[PDB]
């Protein structure tokens, strides 16, 4: 489906490409296969991201990466890519709003769930390769709000920083107040506890 | 990782150094040599600098800003505008012109910063290149007053004549390819 859409959206195929025209245009790789070149990259990139956030043609797992310096757009539909969900920031305002959490709070008898949040475009899955192209905020309110200017172009926000820890490390209370090797040791001791 | 900046040198210490000494490895990971200066050279920093220059390997590639190989049929023609003056001066009383002049020209520009840092001399470099390749290389060097340090190199005039009646159509590397090989060898192994 992505290849069909790319053909629709003014992507000249490699076979039809004059060799001189490649130099000034971005190369579009899908699953590691150089499909063609696109003369205007940013419009295509925005369209692909819109499609993924509406979940129309591009599935949520599909990751689009644009390397602006190297003039390459890479789209991976491959399996085994590790992804974490992140909130989406437009302008400097989080897309997640009070109405969404009100619907989620009454999750029972409203049939509103994480899938509805993904479909609404509030959250998105991002793999590491796409993480390289993403400006993230650790905490929304602190970093998004205007201050002494550090970054005014945040594109995503972390849901909560404590989710970086795994299952065994999540049982440690006040992990940030411990030495790192001690958290590592507790992760191994917690597997051997009795219960 | 946890040495100090006081050493100001790469030093292998700890278990890897113990393994190097225990196994008596032919090649240490960081071979080092501590040189103690005999007399006034130890007292004066400038004399120590002279000894340093004596002890540190320096090649033409380190002091060469850029190299260009030109084709100039006539030395008097001076295809490069800049070298017109000193080529004309040298050819006012030309040397080795009687044998011939090789048309291919290797032009080497030497960075003044590196040249003065190692305290090298244009005449010194010319002598070293002349000694290394014998008479097969003829070198023209600018005066130090010139803003750009230029060394002009041509194939041997006797070799250009070939000094042989038969002349041997082998034509190994012609002269341009031979000049490129000469440039590479000079840059890598000049040992000025």
């Amino acid at each position: 489906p992505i290849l069909e859409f790319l053909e629709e959206w003014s992507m000249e195929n490699l076979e039809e490409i004059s060799p001189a025209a490649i130099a000034d245009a971005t190369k579009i790789f899908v699953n590691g296969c150089w499909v063609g070149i696109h003369k205007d990259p940013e419009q295509l990139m925005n369209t692909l991201r819109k499609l993924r956030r509406q979940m129309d043609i591009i599935v949520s797992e599909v990751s689009m990466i644009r390397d602006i310096r190297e003039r390459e757009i890479r789209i991976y539909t491959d399996a085994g890519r590790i992804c974490r969900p992140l909130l989406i920031v437009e302008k400097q305002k989080l897309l997640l709003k009070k109405r969404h959490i009100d619907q989620l709070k009454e999750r029972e008898y409203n049939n509103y769930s994480w899938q509805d949040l993904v479909a609404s475009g509030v959250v998105e899955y991002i793999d590491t390769l796409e993480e390289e192209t993403v400006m993230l905020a650790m905490t929304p309110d602190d970093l998004q709000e205007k201050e002494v200017a550090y970054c005014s172009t945040y594109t995503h926000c972390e849901i909560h920083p404590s989710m970086i820890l795994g299952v065994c490390a999540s049982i440690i209370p006040f992990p940030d107040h411990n030495q790192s090797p001690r958290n590592t040791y507790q992760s191994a001791m917690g597997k051997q506890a009795m219960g | 990782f946890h040495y100090a900046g006081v050493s100001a040198k790469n030093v292998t210490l700890g278990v890897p150094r113990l393994k190097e000494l225990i196994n008596i490895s032919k090649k240490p990971k960081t071979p080092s040599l501590t040189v103690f200066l005999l007399g006034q050279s130890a007292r004066d920093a400038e004399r120590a600098k002279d000894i340093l220059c004596r002890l540190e390997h320096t090649t033409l590639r380190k002091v060469t800003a850029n190299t260009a190989i030109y084709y100039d049929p006539n030395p008097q023609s001076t295809v490069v505008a800049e070298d017109q003056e000193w080529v004309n001066v040298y050819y006012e009383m030309p040397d080795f012109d009687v044998a011939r002049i090789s048309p291919w020209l290797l032009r080497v520009e030497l960075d003044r910063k590196h040249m003065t840092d190692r305290k090298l001399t244009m005449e010194q470099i010319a002598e070293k290149i002349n000694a290394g390749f014998g008479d097969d290389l003829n070198c023209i060097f600018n005066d130090d007053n010139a803003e750009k340090l230029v060394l002009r190199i041509r194939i041997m005039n006797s070799d250009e004549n070939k000094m042989q009646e038969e002349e041997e159509v082998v034509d190994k590397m012609d002269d341009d390819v031979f000049l490129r090989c000469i440039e590479s060898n000079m840059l890598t192994d000049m040992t000025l």
Partner: peptide
């Protein structure tokens, strides 16, 4: 975890 000269 301390510094460059100390320990990690």
């Amino acid at each position: 975890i301390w510094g460059i000269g100390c320990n990690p």
